[PDB]
Each structure stands twice: as C-alpha cells, then as structure tokens.
Amino acid sequence: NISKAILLGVILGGLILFGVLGNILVILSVACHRHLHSVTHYYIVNLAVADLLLTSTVLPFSAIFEVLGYWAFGRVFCNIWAAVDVLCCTASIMGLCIISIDRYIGVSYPLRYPTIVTQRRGLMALLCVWALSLVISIGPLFGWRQPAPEDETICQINEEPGYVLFSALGSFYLPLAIILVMYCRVYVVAKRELKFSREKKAAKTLGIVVGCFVLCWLPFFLVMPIGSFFPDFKPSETVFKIVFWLGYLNSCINPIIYPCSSQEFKKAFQNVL
C-alpha cells in the first residue's frame, strides 16, 4: 500500500523531527540559564538526553521497519540498534526513578534538601544509574543469546520468552514499583504537610511527567508478557503497533508536558526562541 507507506512515513517523520527539536530545546533551555542549574534540572537534562538519543537512533529505524516490513541494514547494525533501543528504553525509566528520589527528598525536607542531595551526590547517583542501565541493557540479551537466525532481514535478539520476561521486569516493573510507592509517599506528604511551595510545584510537574510516562508505557509491557505467558493471546498486529507507537510517542511527548505545568520552563522556551 503506497498510501499507507507515505502516511506512515510522513507521520513518523514529523513525530521524530518534533521529538528531536523538543528535546534539544529542553536541553538548551536548561543549559542556557546559570540560575536554573540544580540537581533536579540535571536529572531532567538526563531524561531529555535519553529520550533524544532514543529518538534520533531507534525511531527512524523502527519507523523504517514499520514502513518497509523487514531489516535493510547489516546484522551487526541490527544488534547495535537493538542494544541502543533497550539501553535507552531502560535509561529513561532509570532517570525517572532518580527524579522520583530527588523529589521525595525535596518534599520531605524542603530546607535541608541541599544538605541531603548535594551536587556530588547527585552526580554519583546519575553515574550509578547510567551504569546500572548499561548493565541491565547489554547483559541480558548478549550474555544469554541463541544463535543468530539464518536470515539477514530478521532483527530479533532473543527468542526465548525468559529474556523478554526478565527484560520487561528489570526495565519497567521494578522502577515502576519504586516510582509508584515513592510518589504515593510524596502525595501523602503534600496533602498532609517558600521553599516548600517551589519544590511542590517541581514535584507536581515531574509527577505529571511520570504519570504520562507510566500510562503511555504500560500497555506495551502489559501486552508483551501476555503473549509470552500463553502463546495464543496475541490479539492482532493492530494492538501491537498501537501500543508500540504509543510508547514511543510518549517518549516524544515530554517537551509538551514541560511548559504545560512549569511556568519557568515556558518562560525559558519563550526566551530561547
């Protein structure tokens, strides 16, 4: 279908270009302000960089996989693309877990917060979570992998359901549990209990970000394990395409969310243009 091909191509090209532009805009806006340099803003920069690299690498290639219908690149390039894909898809939720910890500490102790989360401690947490993302990404699929398929157009990585289950758990559900429990604490504290108001506004903005991420990434990690458990409950290609592109559009969405809730971010975006 040429009409379907051109529609998919134009829609996904627009989405990926807008995502790159938005993430670059977020990076520039946070970086161009000396006063905005805080550990939470550094975490937001981490999340934006992870989303930007995920976009600029995976999204054109996943869109080409959709439009064409096979892999038109080298097998080692397929391995590299898949590894970068899982790396970014895990590092995004890892950065979200880090911002959740940051905002819980900020809500609980609004004035002692700088003495608990320092610049060195923040960078230590950032580097540690990046390293953990690298491990939980690269190790599972290459440290335990079946022989590569004979076809050069196949771009799978591990066909054993054990790998898909473990990747789903270790890349979505443990960070999801951490984040859900910790913003349960944050919401409880905010509803029960100058610095307080400012960090509460930051908590609300990042909570909206986290909620959008969870809602628009849950269907994917709910439909793949369903298929893996019982090999008869794949509804249709339709639901799979929808949930996949919902998740990646969600990776695109965040630059919309940043000014929708943060007035200072809106002002920074207005100044940078």
């Binding site: 096979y70 398929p149 157009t153 359901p161 289950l165 793949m224 298929g227 090999p231 290609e237 996949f244």
Partner: protein, 65 residues
C-alpha cells in the same frame, strides 16, 4: 517424527506429527519492531514464505532448537 511446537518460559511442548506431516519447520513473522513472532510445528511440506515472512526447513528430531 516429534517436533517441538510452542516454546514458553514454562518450558517446551513436544508432540509428534500426524499422518502426512513429516517435517519440522520454524517460521518468522514481523509483528512489530520489538516482537517478531516465531511459530514452529509439523508439516508435510514447509510452506513457502508470504507477506515477507521467512521459514526454516529442517529434517527431524526437534531440530534447530
């Protein structure tokens, strides 16, 4: 002949082939950029690929896995 057909984390599922079907095959299918469904079972003759699929044709003994 006995071809394994369904692979799950619970384990594998092995059942023999009925009359006429005497080959084990493995067929790929491009569902989505992150889940390429792979089917496997008995066959009298391993079917030709359609819809840009791809098939592995082998002899006996739960081969290729």
């Amino acid at each position: 002949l006995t071809c394994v057909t369904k692979n799950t984390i619970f384990g594998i599922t092995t059942e023999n082939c009925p009359a006429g079907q005497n080959l084990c095959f493995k067929r790929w299918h491009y569902v989505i950029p992150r889940y390429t469904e792979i089917t496997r079972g008995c066959a009298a003759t391993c079917p030709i690929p359609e819809n840009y699929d791809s098939i592995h044709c082998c002899k006996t003994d739960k081969c290729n896995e």
